[PDB]
Amino acid sequence: GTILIDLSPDDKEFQSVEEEMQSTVREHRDGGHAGGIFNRYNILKIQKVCNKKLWERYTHRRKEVSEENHNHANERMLFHGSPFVNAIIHKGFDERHAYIGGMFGAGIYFAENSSKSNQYVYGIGGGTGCPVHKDRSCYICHRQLLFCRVTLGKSFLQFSAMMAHSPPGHHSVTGRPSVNGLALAEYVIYRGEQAYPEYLITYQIMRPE
Numbered sequence: 055g056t057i058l059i060d061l062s063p064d065d066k067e068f069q070s071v072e073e074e075m076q077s078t079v080r081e082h083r084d085g086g087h088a089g090g091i092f093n094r095y096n097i098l099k100i101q102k103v104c105n106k107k108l109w110e111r112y113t114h115r116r117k118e119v120s121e122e123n124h125n126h127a128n129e130r131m132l133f134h135g136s137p138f139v140n141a142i143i144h145k146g147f148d149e150r151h152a153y154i155g156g157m158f159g160a161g162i163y164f165a166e167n168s169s170k171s172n173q174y175v176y177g178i179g180g181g182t183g184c185p186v187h188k189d190r191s192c193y194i195c196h197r198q199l200l201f202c203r204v205t206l207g208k209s210f211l212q213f214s215a216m217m218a219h220s221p222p223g224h225h226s227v228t229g230r231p232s233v234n235g236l237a238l239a240e241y242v243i244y245r246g247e248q249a250y251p252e253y254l255i256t257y258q259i260m261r262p263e
């Protein structure tokens with residue numbers, strides 16, 4: 055069902071996605087261990103992910119959520135990094151894509167910081183790095199992130215020092231940073247239907263000069 059349509063770099067939609075990718079890079083407390091050392095990315099391709107079935111799966115759930123939340127889906131655009139990216143874009147998000155050991159329980163995790171999702175591209179803690187060089191900080195191998203439309207609904211605020219169910223009466227969990235000054239928020243949904251994998255970004259991390 056899925057088709058991938060390339061966006062021209064001249065297209066304002068390309069530029070706005072690249073800008074969110076680039077401007078949400080931060081330094082991480084692991085000093086680059088999981089995701090590599092970089093301040094910016096070389097964006098190689100942005101593709102729009104088009105799947106009618108999956109989109110309708112998403113908009114149905116979004117409607118259910120907003121109807122439970124005074125007509126407010128609380129929709130965000132958030133990054134997602136995973137070794138299952140290629141599965142996700144064909145079959146949609148489901149329980150196989152959950153971070154089982156996550157600080158907010160077994161759910162599917164999204165980030166405001168692109169560099170945060172970048173840590174999971176090769177797996178939990180960056181795994182053993184790129185399959186070709188076994189290097190978590192590879193500057194050569196091509197990486198992929200998703201920029202996703204996500205329905206938060208009523209989100210449970212977890213103040214935090216940084217498949218299951220949502221907490222009763224909520225539709226998601228918000229991981230609010232309570233120590234790392236510059237960290238952006240992280241979010242968890244417990245229904246895969248509450249996200250749609252809208253953009254596939256192919257990129258490299260870049261070596262600082």
Ligand SMILES: Nc1cccc2c(=O)[nH]c(-c3ccc(Cl)cc3)cc12
Nearest residue numbers: 134135136153163164165171174240
């Ligand atoms: N803990 C996280 C916080 C923010 C963003 C992400 C994210 O983008 N991906 C992930 C992730 C994805 C797949 C698997 Cl198998 C494990 C973790 C976590 C994650």
Ligand SMILES: [Zn+2]
Nearest residue numbers: 184187192195
């Ligand atoms: Zn490599």
